[PDB]
């Protein structure tokens, strides 16, 4: 092929990568249906903040995919105890992630696997949302969906309690953690099971009413909880600002419908405000 | 999104005479690779078209009676798949009922309609040893029919824009009182663009539209007001001429469209099989 | 420096769609179908079936090859 194999890079149950001169090479039921996906959805989406889908190539029923070489994720970092998180730095990942998310939105694709390891950053310090084997459209009505899609510490209320139908609220949600991942350096709500997941929420921000979230009750797989007070955002957070924390509240809102979308999220004071997002080339380097 | 999609910058082609070279093209090539690897069997480019609808309407047949229900979102991706395989390959070299097939299994998978492999080639009318053969062919061209639609899966189809222009109609449109008389025509002249290029050469926005007022016209209802008014168009006659042309054109191709004969289906059939059984 | 929204531009080659949140005052919604109280626990609403509805029916329709 066109493609000399220099490195290594991961394995799993789905597909392994390695680095190849510089790109990034992920290889009676026929083409795996995760490649087919990723491919058909990231041929029609072209953003800086969303990875892109080079080339694609492969044998038989086997299929190669080729992306560009990306240098590290956002789970590296928040993981990584030299690094220091300045606000700026936090802002400017917010800012690419939600970016990308807003150009997804807008082509009505859901990421539905949000989180810190799917977030990659290259050597420019420029963010792009990855991992697209789970993504799917969303605002047919004719199309159900599945409520076990997300990883469980970054999967919404609404998704726990099986919601077939949902919308760009499963992705804000999973970017609320992501903030909270980087705020607190480890991750917001470790749920052992969806049930512990569940309490973990109501126990952090509290017990949704029906003022909070008019139809919750309706949900096939809806379970009443303890009245939880929940703990106040700020004590939680305790370094952040009170736009951040709006962000914040907009972002963990238990009504999906009325969950920040990433356009409004872009437009909240928080991100315009100084200190302004850290240039790419400043970026902390793991 | 269609404005951004692969299928306009790639698989939107200006002319029937642009999709004619590239047929010919095709056809070019297998006859100097089969001359160059070892003649009255070989095929004509439009014994090729004729072909190639015959076995589009043999899907269409096969998509129809799917179990369980196919979404016309898959049919219609499977069609269009069949349409840009066959643009640049000629079925000579690969047989369409395998390729036809194919193109609804990669359609099933690509729009997410979750079929089982077993399920699927249940619905083919033979024997299980003979549903097993075409299982393990379609496996086998499953790759080569992905590489021949250059990794463009995303098939962009008229129904949600016309589901859109139907919404704006009852919206905006108070004149055409009831638009939901202008769905049951304007779905068949849909079927009857389907039949031809047209998904080759317009958007389906377009194709929608046309459809709708061609189904219009049928019921004696002019809406060029709506194309003026409320499409703004006459604050751009430059637009609106264009889009009327468009239109045109696309009721141009349904009106010349020619239904493959029984019996040159039959006789193109010998000599596509005695093809296959060559080289 | 500091960060200003400013909204994607994106060429759809066809008629402005009205914006999401405005379909409903004018109209629009009257002709979709109604999210169940379960959608809209979920977070879908009719809204957002109109808008692609519409945003499809616009896209690329004034378009030329
Ligand atoms: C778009 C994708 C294909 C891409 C682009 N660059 N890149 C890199 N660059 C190197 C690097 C090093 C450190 C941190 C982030 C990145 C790595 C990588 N994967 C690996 C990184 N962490 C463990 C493993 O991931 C699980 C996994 C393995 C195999 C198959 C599926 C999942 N994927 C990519």
Known sequence: KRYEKLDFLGEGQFATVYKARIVAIKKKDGINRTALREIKLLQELSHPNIIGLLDAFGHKSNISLVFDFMETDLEVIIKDNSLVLTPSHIKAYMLM???????????????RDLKPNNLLLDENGVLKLADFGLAKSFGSPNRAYTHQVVTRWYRAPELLF???????????????????ELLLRV?????????????????????????????????????????????????????????????????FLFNPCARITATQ?????????????????????? | MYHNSSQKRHWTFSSEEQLARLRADANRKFRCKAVANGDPVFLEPHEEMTLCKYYEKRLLEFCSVFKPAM????????????????????????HPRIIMLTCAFLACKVDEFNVSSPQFVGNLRESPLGQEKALEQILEYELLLIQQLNF??????????????????????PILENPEILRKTADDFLNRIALTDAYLLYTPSQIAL????????????????????????????????????????????????????????????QKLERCHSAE | ALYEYQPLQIETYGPHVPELEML??????????????????????????????????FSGLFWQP
């Open chain 1, 162 to 180: 099986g919601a077939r139908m949902y919308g760009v609220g499963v992705d804000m949600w999973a970017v609320g953690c992501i903030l909270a």
């Open chain 2, 210 to 269: 046309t459809a709708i007022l061609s189904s219009a016209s049928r019921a004696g209802i002019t809406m060029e007001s709506y194309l003026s008014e409320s499409l703004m168009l006459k604050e751009n006659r430059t637009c609106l001429s264009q889009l009327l042309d468009i239109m045109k054109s696309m009721r141009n191709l349904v009106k010349k469209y020619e239904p493959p004969r029984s019996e040159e289906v039959a006789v193109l059939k």
């Open chain 1, 265 to 286: 999220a872009l437009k909240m004071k928080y991100f315009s405000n100084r200190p302004g997002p850290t240039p790419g080339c400043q970026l902390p380097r793991p």
């Open chain 1, 187 to 251: 991750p917001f709500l470790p749920g052992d099971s969806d049930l512990d997941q569940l309490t973990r929420i109501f126990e952090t921000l509290g017990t949704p009413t029906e003022e909070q979230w008019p139809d919750m009750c309706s949900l096939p797989d809806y379970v009443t909880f303890k009245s939880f007070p929940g703990i106040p955002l700020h004590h939680i957070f305790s370094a952040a600002g009170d736009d951040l924390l709006d962000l914040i509240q907009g972002l």
């Open chain 3, 24 to 57: 409903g005052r004018l109209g629009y919604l009257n002709h979709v179908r109604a999210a169940s109280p379960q959608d809209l626990a979920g977070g879908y609403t009719s809204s957002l079936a109109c808008h692609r509805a519409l945003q499809d029916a």
């Open chain 1, 97 to 111: 992630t939600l970016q990308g998310l807003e150009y997804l939105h807008q082509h009505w694709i859901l990421h």
């Open chain 2, 152 to 173: 463009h899966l995303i098939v962009h189809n008229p129904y949600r824009p016309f589901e859109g222009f139907l919404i704006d109609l009852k919206t905006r449109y």
């Open chain 2, 71 to 94: 979404p016309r979102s898959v049919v219609g991706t499977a069609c269009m798949y069949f349409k840009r395989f066959y643009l640049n390959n000629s079925v000579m070299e690969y």
